[PDB]
Structure formats: C-alpha cells, structure tokens
Amino acid sequence: HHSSGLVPRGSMESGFTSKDTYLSHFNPRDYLEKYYKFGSRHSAESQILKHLLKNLFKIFCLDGVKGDLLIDIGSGPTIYQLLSACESFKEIVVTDYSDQNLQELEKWLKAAPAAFDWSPVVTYVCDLEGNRVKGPEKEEKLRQAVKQVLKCDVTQSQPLGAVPLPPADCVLSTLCLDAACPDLPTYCRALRNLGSLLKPGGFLVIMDALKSSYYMIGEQKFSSLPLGREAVEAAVKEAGYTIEWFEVISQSYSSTMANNEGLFSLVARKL
Numbered sequence: 510h511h512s513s514g515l516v517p518r519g520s521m522e523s524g525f526t527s528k529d530t531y532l533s534h535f536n537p538r539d540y541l542e543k544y545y546k547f548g549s550r551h552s553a554e555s556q557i558l559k560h561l562l563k564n565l566f567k568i569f570c571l572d573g574v575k576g577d578l579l580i581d582i583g584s585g586p587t588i589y590q591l592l593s594a595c596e597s598f599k600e601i602v603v604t605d606y607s608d609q610n611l612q613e614l615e616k617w618l619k620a621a622p623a624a625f626d627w628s629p630v631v632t633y634v635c636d637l638e639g640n641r642v643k644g645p646e647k648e649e650k651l652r653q654a655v656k657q658v659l660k661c662d663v664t665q666s667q668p669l670g671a672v673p674l675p676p677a678d679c680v681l682s683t684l685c686l687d688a689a690c691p692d693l694p695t696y697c698r699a700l701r702n703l704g705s706l707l708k709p710g711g712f713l714v715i716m717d718a719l720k721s722s723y724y725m726i727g728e729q730k731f732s733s734l735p736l737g738r739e740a741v742e743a744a745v746k747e748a749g750y751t752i753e754w755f756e757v758i759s760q761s762y763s764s765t766m767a768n769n770e771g772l773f774s775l776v777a778r779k780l
C-alpha cells in the first residue's frame with residue numbers, strides 16, 4: 510500500500526503515520542544527509558540547526574539547567590542536541606523508537622569510520638562555548654557522557670519499558686513529539702509518560718516545529734501534529750508542568766522538506 514505523496518506514509522487508514530513506518534521507512538543516513546548535511550551555506554535547514562544549538566547552549570550553559578542524569582527522547586540518528594548538555598550533566602541516556610536510528614547512534618559512539626560526520630556542527634558549538642576546547646576534545650567528552658542507548662516509545666506508560674533508570678534531572682526532546690503523537694490527547698499523555706522519568710521539579714526541555722502537518726525525507730512523507738503555541742502551552746501545563754520560558758521563531762524549513770510555520774523552544778519544570 511503506497512499513496513505516492515497523496516498522504517504521508519503509513520497514514521492512509523488512520524490519518525497519521527503509524528509507528529511501524531518508522532521501523533521500516535525511516536532511513537537514518539538519508540535523514541542526516543537531508544537535514545544535517547549542508548551542500549550550500551545559509552540554507553533554511555542550516556539556520557534552524559544554528560538556532561537550536563544556540564538555544565541549547567543558552568539553556569544548559571548560560572542558564573542553570575544541570576544535574577546528574579539527562580534523558581534524550583526521540584533523538585533519532587542525531588547527536589547535536591547533546592553537545593552543550595554534556596557540559597552540564599554527568600550521564601546522558603539517548604533514546605529513540607527506530608532501531609535503525611539506534612544503530613546509527615551506536616556507530617558514532619564507537620567512532621566507526623562509516624559513521625556520520627558531525628565535526629562542522631561540533632566546531633560551531635565549540636565557538637559558542639568560547640573556544641575552550643576544539644572539535645575532537647568536545648566529541649570525546651560527549652561520547653564518554655552517553656552511558657546508554659535504549660529504545661523508547663512515548664505512547665507507553667513506561668516509555669523505556671522495564672529498563673531501570675534513576676529519576677532524571679532533565680528530559681530533552683527535539684523534533685520528536687510532533688511526529689510521535691497523532692492527536693493532542695496522545696500528546697498530553699506522552700508528556701505525562703516522560704514525567705514518570707523525572708524527579709519532582711526536574712526540567713523538561715522541548716523543541717519542535719509549529720503548525721507542521723508533515724515533514725519530508727527525500728520522497729518519503731511523514732506525518733506531524735500541527736500544533737500551535739497556544740495548544741502546546743495548554744498541553745504542557747495540563748500534563749503537570751510549569752513553563753519557565755517559551756520561545757517561538759518564524760524561521761521555517763523549506764516546504765520541500767516540511768510545511769512548518771516556525772519552531773518553538775520551552776523549558777518547563779515538573780509540578
């Protein structure tokens with residue numbers, strides 16, 4: 510069953526991309542080449558990455574978002590969202606639903622030659638942090654900080670299954686909840702499930718697209734929940750969090766890659 514661009518893959522029946530689609534049709538190499546590999550500078554996807562890195566830098570380095578344990582939810586094949594965080598947290602746990610994404614992640618932790626090249630992104634973060642260290646030293650600190658790579662499902666009461674983890678100080682999730690939640694009630698339940706991994710008063714850091722109904726990996730279209738800022742704030746507060754700050758930007762992806770109307774960033778604390 511293929512729709513050929515009429516509807517997102519795995520959504521003809523339910524209206525939203527199913528979880529099985531990510532296990533079979535989400536190619537981590539093609540995703541990294543499309544969104545985090547840049548042919549010409551100053552591209553729309555490069556501007557979004559630069560803004561994400563600057564916010565993560567401000568959150569973990571300039572602000573007081575630190576702790577012992579950081580859990581990354583829906584990381585996919587990416588590690589850019591952890592570069593500043595490894596300076597504030599001793600241990601980092603990386604999670605995603607796609608087994609292929611976990612394989613691409615584990616290839617980078619072992620520094621395999623066929624792994625993705627994150628050095629231009631690492632150098633940018635080093636410049637943001639005052640050039641105290643260089644690229645290779647920055648990457649090694651993150652690899653030593655990542656202590657576990659697990660499979661996760663935000664729709665389950667126990668997102669990590671039966672794996673025992675201590676209550677985390679922060680939960681980070683970038684560009685995942687819009688793709689993992691078919692509706693707002695599931696979005697609210699997903700936020701609650703992540704709360705079961707947090708200490709009372711732990712931080713919730715979320716960055717995602719705004720009013721996005723789909724995103725593209727080459728020719729493959731994947732569904733996205735078109736949430737507005739107003740809907741996001743209500744869902745976060747309803748799930749039992751207090752928002753410390755909430756930022757929205759107008760910069761969007763290219764329509765040939767996503768139909769978003771900007772992105773948002775928020776830091777919340779568990780009530």
Ligand SMILES: NC(=O)c1cccc(C#C[C@@H](CC[C@H](N)C(=O)O)C[C@H]2O[C@@H](n3cnc4c(N)ncnc43)[C@H](O)[C@@H]2O)c1
Nearest residue numbers: 583584585606607661662663683684687689718721724733
């Ligand atoms: N919304 C948009 O328009 C849009 C625009 C551009 C890019 C994206 C995206 C994406 C990726 C993550 C990117 C990564 N985090 C990063 O930072 O780039 C979605 C990830 O979410 C995971 N997943 C899907 N279902 C899940 C579930 N039930 N439980 C946990 N994980 C789930 C998938 O495996 C996938 O890896 C979305």
